């Protein structure tokens, strides 16, 4: 079973913070409450590798008390009651931290980084957003049916807008369970088969999520799991998915090893669902569906709505017994639902170890 695996092979450590220390922890170790709320234009620090190393060197001079490029950008966080320390690099004074850091592949080669206090998320996700009316008129009762039909409808400072990888910052907490599926497959796969296979991914993974987070009312019907499939399937060799789940209510996860453990448990739980491996087997060569080593500090995951140098676009696997379908569709666009260290949407418990 899976109870057995999470009875022997996982050792939870949780620390119930409470009262004001809860708010302090949330504000301190997650992105600021406006880092992922949309904005008319970006205030950020975007340049190539070399120009970023320079701009860091030119920010050090402004940082006289501080000692003395993907550790240092990921390091530059604080606030105080004055502007934060990043503001020497970003060059505004109304920046707020912690704030995202991104790795940007550039044509023809080379890497750029972008620490940004806010961005225009509509410019990124308007050519993927279904109008509230189009949803509300799509009229299609069965949720496999509605999900599948809705899926049917659908310079460094410019290159950030087609390739953007999010960098894990182990200083920060984790509020979302960002899985990185890499299903390799021998014969191609239709899309209704995949869509139903994902309906069976969500159910098993939510059972795993509920075992790992015991004091959480994670109803395996309405709990949101957000799926993005990299662009009929037409996809041979490899089929890249991305599954993002909110961390359940009172929990937050801390650690690279803690989230490596969460991912591996979800992997074994979905491989222990007999339905999933029927629905998806005989197409799938390997079975390692989850690169649990992507949660290491300094490592990057391509974000939804960004290509590769396949736009990760949603596959609405609508919850069984969902409640407000317009809202579930709309959340595939809020950046908070697909960044590691986002603000969560009394006490909290921090799962800082699994073993």
């Amino acid at each position: 079973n899976i109870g057995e695996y999470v009875k022997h092979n996982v050792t939870p450590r949780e620390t119930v913070l409470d009262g004001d220390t809860a708010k302090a922890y949330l504000r301190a170790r997650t992105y600021a409450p406006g880092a992922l709320t949309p904005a008319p234009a970006y205030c950020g620090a975007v340049d190539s590798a070399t120009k970023m190393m320079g701009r860091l060197a030119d920010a050090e001079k402004l940082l006289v008390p501080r000692g003395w490029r993907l550790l240092r950008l990921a390091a530059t966080e604080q606030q105080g009651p004055t502007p934060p320390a990043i503001a020497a690099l970003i060059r505004n004074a109304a920046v707020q931290t912690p704030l995202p850091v991104y790795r940007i592949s550039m044509v023809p080669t080379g890497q750029a980084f972008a620490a940004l206090a806010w961005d225009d998320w509509a410019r990124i996700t308007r050519d993927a957003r279904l109008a509230e009316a189009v949803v509300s008129a799509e009229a299609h009762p069965d949720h496999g049916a509605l999900g599948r039909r809705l899926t049917d409808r659908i310079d460094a400072g410019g290159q950030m807008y087609v390739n953007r990888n999010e960098i894990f910052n182990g200083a920060l907490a984790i509020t979302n369970i960002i899985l990185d599926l890499d299903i390799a497959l021998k014969e191609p796969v239709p899309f209704r088969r995949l869509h139903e296979a994902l309906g069976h991914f969500r159910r098993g993974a939510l059972a795993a999520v509920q075992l790992l987070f015991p004091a959480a009312r994670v109803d395996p019907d309405a709990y949101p799991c957000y799926f993005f499939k990299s662009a009929v399937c037409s996809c041979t060799d490899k089929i890249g998915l991305r599954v993002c789940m909110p961390v359940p209510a009172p929990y937050v996860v801390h650690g690279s090893l803690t989230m490596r453990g969460v991912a591996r448990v979800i992997q074994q739980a979905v491989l222990l669902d007999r339905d999933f491996v029927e629905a998806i087997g005989s197409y799938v060569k390997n079975f390692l569906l989850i690169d649990t080593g992507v949660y290491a500090h300094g490592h990057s995951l391509r974000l939804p709505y960004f290509a590769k140098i396949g736009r990760l676009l949603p596959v609405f696997v609508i919850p069984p017994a969902c409640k407000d379908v317009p809202a579930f569709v709309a959340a595939h666009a809020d950046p908070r639902r697909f960044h590691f260290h986002a603000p969560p949407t009394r006490e909290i418990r921090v799962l800082h170890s699994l073993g």
């Binding site: 450590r13 620390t15 913070l17 004001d20 220390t21 302090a24 922890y25 301190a28 940082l63 006289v64 008390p65 501080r66 000692g67 390091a75 604080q78 606030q79 105080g80 004055t82 320390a85 182990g170 200083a171 801390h254 650690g255 921090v350 800082h352 170890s353």
Partner: protein, 683 residues
């Protein structure tokens, strides 16, 4: 015989007479009626060596101070402490008794020849002084010094640079001297452009010294309507150096210009002071009645000269031996086999705890200073400084200022004598064997201490009732009278009769180290904790937590429930420390110049804040930050709260292991899981 009142005594010139060893000095008197006079003094080679513990040609080539050369004392500080103490001894030994601010009889060659003692004196007026300066010291030269002297306080490196390039004080921005008139002064560069005549009076007096074959002419600055200043070392130095270069421009005689302070030693010095012993002519006290009175009592040489106020360094072995001889031979065998780590009284061997009893803590106030003063008279068989110690002893009890001096004087008196410690240690031993012997008979049982401060349990009281004040009173009287009788029986005569303080009555006590003891009163929830380090604000919050935790823990009168209370206290402490995870000044510890983080080179360019670093360096941490060598507010990576909480938890764990072992007999060292729970909060 003008009935007057000297306000300051300051060294004007130091020369060798025509022929040969007997160097002379010329002293400047600031005298006031109900005026500026002078005296001349001679000092021999031997007296100099006595106050030093080298050669008089090396204390007359400190007549290179009559010039721009600014910090000549940094070259050899004890030489100046020596020269000034020896002049103040030659002056009383040749001109007679001399007392700042006190009514006096002055018999003036123009040199004051005699000053016998003798009206309501003019109350000392005070002048306020605020001064700031921007010396441009190159912060790569200020790092070479610490390259040579790895523990060097940076006020010293600052002064040493200002010494290696005097011209840094010339081009330096720089004063607001309020005197009840007003003296402000812009100085964009201090070598370029209220009245300096309503603040000082420039006086020229003609003198005919015996060891000088000419009518020498001394030019001075006589203060008007003020007698001292009340307040940066480089800042004042350069101000007074400008005043000197200006006043002493035309042909006449040039004063000394020497200053001393803790900034003038490489390793600093705990207390602040700015000793004027030269050009200006009057002090600068950096409440204030305290510094004023200390000035007046010790003739102004304290803390400038050090322990030389009381008696020369190399005349302490004689008094040590002489006092040793006068003691009763049992006490003398004690004085001769004292070694610092000895077990004289049987004490509660830690870890140990005393439960519901009438615990009490008695201390003989200022006993070490009283002993030193008495043993100085016993070893007396010149005594001007001996009288100075006795004076502080008879005033310390009621005048708080005198205490601070003795609290530093007695330790500094043997910071030099290596055998006056044995007299202090050995007579200390006899003071403890009595108290033990008397406690045998007064229903008291010494449980710990040293003999000037001790505590114990009245193991006869009924653990209750109002017949506990009576027994503690009887015990305090018995021990006071017995210790007094013992000290007499050895011919040690105390300035003012001993008082045995009762510094609290308690009902529980736990002892976990030699110095670590916590006390608590169950009747009224009052306590005392001693032995915990207070190295910063984090440690005072921690000490409060340890005290509240021990109150609950001893309110349980098993061990496991105690451990629950202890880990609950540590949990709540780490969380409330998280709320202050940004407050750098809170996590900063104070590190002495003896306890071994290295300096960031970026701190070498902190400008006029390095000049406030004379003793303590306040450091956060992983890389160390001297939080005071940087302007405000700081801009820091996260403070290493795990490092600091680890330190604090180690000390709290000493306390808690002590209490658990002592009260409940657990062999289990208390340990707090930090790396396992609560480490993540600071990762």
């Amino acid at each position: 015989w003008v009935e007057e009142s000297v306000s300051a005594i300051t060294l004007y010139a130091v020369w060798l007479p025509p022929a040969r060893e007997y160097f002379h000095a010329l002293v400047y008197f600031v005298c006031r009626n109900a005026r500026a006079r002078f005296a001349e003094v001679s000092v021999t080679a031997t007296e100099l060596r006595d106050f030093y513990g080298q050669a008089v040609v090396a204390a007359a080539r400190a007549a290179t101070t009559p010039a721009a050369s600014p910090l000549e004392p940094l070259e050899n500080p004890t030489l100046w402490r020596a020269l000034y103490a020896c002049v103040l001894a030659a002056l009383e030994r040749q001109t007679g008794p001399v007392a700042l601010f006190a009514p006096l009889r002055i018999g003036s060659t123009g040199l004051v020849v005699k000053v016998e003692r003798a009206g309501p004196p003019a109350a000392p007026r005070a002048a306020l002084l605020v001064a700031e300066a921007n010396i441009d010291i190159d912060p790569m030269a200020l790092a070479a010094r610490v390259a040579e002297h790895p523990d060097a306080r940076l006020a010293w490196a600052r002064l040493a640079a200002i010494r290696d390039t005097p011209q840094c004080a010339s081009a330096a921005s720089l004063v607001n001297i309020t005197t009840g008139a007003l003296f402000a002064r812009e100085y964009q560069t201090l070598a370029f452009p209220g009245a300096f005549g309503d603040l000082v009076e420039v006086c020229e007096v003609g003198l005919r010294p015996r060891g000088h074959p000419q009518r020498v002419t001394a030019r001075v600055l006589l203060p008007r309507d003020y007698d001292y200043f009340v307040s940066s070392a480089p800042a004042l130095v350069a101000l007074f150096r400008q005043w000197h270069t200006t006043v002493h421009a035309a042909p006449a005689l040039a004063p000394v210009f020497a200053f001393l302070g803790p900034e003038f030693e490489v390793r600093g010095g705990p207390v602040p002071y700015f000793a004027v012993l030269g050009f200006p002519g009057w002090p600068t006290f950096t409440l204030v009645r305290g510094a004023a009175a200390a000035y007046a009592a010790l003739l102004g040489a304290w803390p400038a000269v050090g322990a030389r106020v009381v008696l020369p360094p190399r005349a302490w072995p004689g008094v040590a031996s002489a006092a040793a001889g006068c003691l009763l031979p049992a006490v003398r065998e004690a004085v001769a086999r004292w070694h610092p780590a000895t077990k004289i009284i049987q004490l509660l061997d830690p870890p140990a705890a005393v439960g519901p009893v009438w615990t009490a803590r008695f201390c003989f106030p200022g006993l070490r200073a009283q002993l030193l003063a008495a043993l100085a008279d016993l070893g007396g068989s010149g005594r001007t400084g001996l009288a100075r110690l006795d004076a502080l002893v008879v005033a310390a009890p009621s005048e708080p200022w005198a205490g601070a001096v003795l609290e530093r004087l007695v330790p500094d008196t043997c910071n030099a004598c290596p055998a006056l410690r044995q007299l202090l240690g050995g007579v200390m031993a006899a003071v403890c064997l009595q108290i033990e012997e008397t406690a045998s008979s007064v229903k008291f049982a010494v449980c710990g201490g040293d003999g000037g401060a001790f505590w114990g349990v009245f193991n006869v009281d009924p653990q209750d009732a109002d017949a506990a004040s009576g027994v503690i009173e009887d015990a305090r009287r018995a021990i006071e009278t017995a210790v007094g009788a013992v000290l007499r029986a050895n011919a040690v005569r105390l300035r003012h009769p001993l008082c045995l303080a009762l510094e609290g009555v308690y009902t529980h006590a736990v002892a976990w180290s030699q110095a670590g003891v916590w006390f608590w009163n169950s009747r009224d929830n009052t306590d005392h904790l001693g032995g915990f380090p207070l190295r910063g604000p984090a440690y005072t919050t921690a000490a409060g937590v340890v005290r509240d935790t021990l109150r609950r823990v001893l309110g349980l009168t098993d061990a496991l429930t105690a451990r629950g209370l202890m880990e609950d206290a540590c949990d709540r402490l780490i969380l409330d420390a998280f709320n202050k995870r940004l407050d750098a000044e809170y996590w900063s510890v104070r590190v002495s110049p003896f306890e071994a983080d290295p300096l960031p080179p970026t701190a070498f360019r902190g400008g006029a804040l390095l000049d406030a670093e004379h003793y303590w360096r306040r450091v956060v941490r992983s890389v160390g930050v001297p939080v005071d060598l940087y302007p405000r507010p700081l801009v820091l990576p996260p403070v290493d709260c795990a490092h600091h909480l680890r330190e604090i938890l180690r000390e709290i764990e000493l306390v808690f292991t002590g209490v658990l072992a002592g009260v409940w007999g657990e062999g289990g060292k208390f340990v707090y899981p930090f790396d396992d729970k609560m480490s993540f909060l600071f990762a």
